[PDB]
Structures are given as structure tokens and as C-alpha cells.
């Protein structure tokens, strides 16, 4: 989840650093958001279960 | 919170010896005895209750040590949490107590000054806090006397025991203190060397 150049040219050396997480990234990023203004109605029909 | 640490040598297996919650007293000699300097007083530097002992060692450097750390009598109060009991009626057949706040675990402390309230607060729980000392309890080692405050400006108080939900006596001690108008801390008793004092 991250890749960056690294290097202190004073010491005459550079490296590349990569870091990540063990499959915690998909869940942690997937936020179950909330939609505020959607009715989703139907003409003279409706669902017997609520919600 | 006041905390201290001690480094010990690895000659003996201290893990099996030093049981937790023991009391350690430290004395430091400032200068030479026979010179008759003012520093020849064997003044105690700190006293407290151990609360952790752990092996330590970096075998790469070929050296090991044992580390012990504790706090200066803040451990009993901080750990003693005045919890709440939810489902106890405590009734009696055709009899009852005329004072309210009875049957239930409610306790009310009343005084016209901090030294009056704090005496009642400390005295309520201190004796029953029992430990395995071969000789006593915290009341012998802590004077908690010579307390004072602004008695003239402070009226009568009805400070409740359970003002803080399942909090420690230190949390309830802070309310009584009413900082910053009164200063509370733990320090050595110079007037009575060898024991601590609550100020």
C-alpha cells in the first residue's frame, strides 16, 4: 500500500521502501456508507419484509 | 503518580524470591562518616510498593540484569476501585432504617473542611485494606495527619462515595482535593523518618 524513494546523498546511498498489510487493507478501506435521499418506491406494489 | 525503578544484578534468581507488593526502603549516605559533616544523616530517599519484576538481558553483549519498579504508596488507592452493585435489595421484615441511602451500598461523607472530609474518606477504607505483613497495614506506615484547608470559606459538604462510576479512590480523592486550591502529594516524613506521609 505504499512505495517511496529513499536516500541520503550525503552518505552516498539510496534505497526503495515498500510496506503493506496482511489482507487487512480491503476490509479497513471498505466503508459501509449511508445514503440519505433514496426512496426506491414502486407503483402499487411493495415488499412484505420491512427494511 | 510517583514511580521508581531499581536495577539488580543477576547473581541470584530474584524472580523466585521477591514476591509482588513488597515494601522496599532505600537509604543513601551522602558523604564520609568520620568527617562529621552535616550530610551524615542517613536520610531516606524514597519508599514504595513494588509492582513488577522482570528478567532483562542482551546475550549479544553478554550481560543480564533484573529490574524492579514500584510506586510510593499510590498502588493501594489507585487499584481499589469503588465498584457498583446493581441487583441487591437488602430488605427486612416489617423494619426499616430511618436514614435514607440505607440497604444499598450508598455511603455519604460530611464535613466542613477538607481535613474533616479527607479523614472520613481515608478512615472509611484504610483499615480493611489488609495485607500479609509479618509485623500492621497502610495506616501504620502512612500518617495522613496534620491536614488543613480553607475551613472558613468552605461550607458544609455532602460528598458522595460513588461520584465516579467504578473509579479508584485516587479519582475520588481528586474531587475532595478541589485542585488547584489545595495541594496533594506523597512525600517522605522528615519529622518522623522511616515512614511516609500523605499531605
Amino acid at each position: 500500500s505504499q512505495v517511496s524513494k529513499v536516500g541520503s546523498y550525503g552518505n552516498d546511498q539510496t534505497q526503495f521502501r515498500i510496506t503493506g498489510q496482511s489482507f487487512v487493507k480491503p476490509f479497513m478501506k471498505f466503508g459501509l456508507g449511508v445514503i440519505q435521499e433514496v426512496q426506491a418506491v414502486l407503483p402499487e406494489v411493495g415488499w412484505l419484509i420491512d427494511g | 503518580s510517583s514511580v521508581f525503578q531499581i536495577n539488580m544484578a543477576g547473581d541470584t534468581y530474584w524472580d523466585k524470591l521477591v514476591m509482588a507488593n513488597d515494601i522496599i526502603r532505600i537509604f543513601i549516605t551522602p558523604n564520609d562518616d568520620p568527617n562529621d559533616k552535616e550530610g551524615k544523616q542517613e536520610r531516606l530517599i524514597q519508599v514504595g510498593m513494588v509492582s513488577q519484576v522482570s528478567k532483562v538481558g542482551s546475550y549479544g553483549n553478554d550481560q543480564t540484569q533484573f529490574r524492579i519498579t514500584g510506586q510510593s504508596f499510590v498502588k493501594p488507592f489507585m487499584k481499589f476501585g469503588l465498584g457498583v452493585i446493581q441487583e441487591v435489595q437488602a430488605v427486612l421484615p416489617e423494619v426499616g432504617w430511618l436514614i435514607d441511602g440505607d440497604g444499598d451500598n450508598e455511603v455519604k461523607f460530611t464535613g466542613s473542611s477538607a481535613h474533616e472530609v479527607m479523614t472520613g474518606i481515608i478512615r472509611r477504607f484504610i483499615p480493611y485494606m489488609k495485607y500479609n505483613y509479618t509485623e500492621n497495614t497502610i495506616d501504620n506506615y502512612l500518617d495522613y495527619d496534620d491536614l488543613s484547608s480553607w475551613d472558613e470559606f468552605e461550607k458544609l459538604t455532602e460528598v458522595s462515595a460513588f461520584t465516579n462510576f467504578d473509579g479508584s479512590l485516587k479519582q475520588l480523592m481528586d474531587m475532595v482535593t478541589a485542585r488547584p486550591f489545595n495541594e496533594l502529594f506523597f512525600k517522605n516524613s522528615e519529622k518522623t523518618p522511616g515512614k511516609a506521609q500523605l499531605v
Binding site: - | 478512615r123 483499615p127 480493611y128 489488609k130 509485623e135 497495614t137 495506616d139 501504620n140
Partner: protein
């Protein structure tokens, strides 16, 4: 003294020890508001702790 005290207290019944704990707590409430049998006071408690079991000083010893 310590050894036979400990043996006594092991031999006591759970209710006996519970009452001893109650008496100790009561005494603690009432607080306010190298060994040698000769020429030494450090072992005073051991002689007193050994008592209160041969004599029924309360349902269980004290201290």
C-alpha cells in the same frame, strides 16, 4: 511457633478461618478512631500468635 501456628490454621475449618478474618478486620478497624526467647522482643508475636487456638479467644485465632 510459626510452624505450629500454620499447622493449626491449616487444620481449622473454613468457617473458623472466615471468622478469624472477620475478627482481624474488626481489630484493624479499632486501630484508631536472630530470634531468641531471652532478651529479645522480635519473637513476641510468635508466642501470642501461638495462643488464641489452645484457648478459644474467639472462633479462630487473631493476627
Amino acid at each position: 511457633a510459626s510452624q505450629r501456628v500454620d499447622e493449626g490454621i491449616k487444620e481449622l475449618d473454613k468457617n473458623a478461618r472466615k471468622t478469624r478474618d472477620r475478627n482481624n478486620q474488626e481489630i484493624s478497624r479499632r486501630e484508631n478512631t536472630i530470634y531468641n526467647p531471652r532478651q529479645s522482643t522480635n519473637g513476641l508475636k510468635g508466642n501470642i500468635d501461638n495462643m488464641a487456638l489452645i484457648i478459644g479467644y474467639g472462633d479462630g485465632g487473631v493476627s
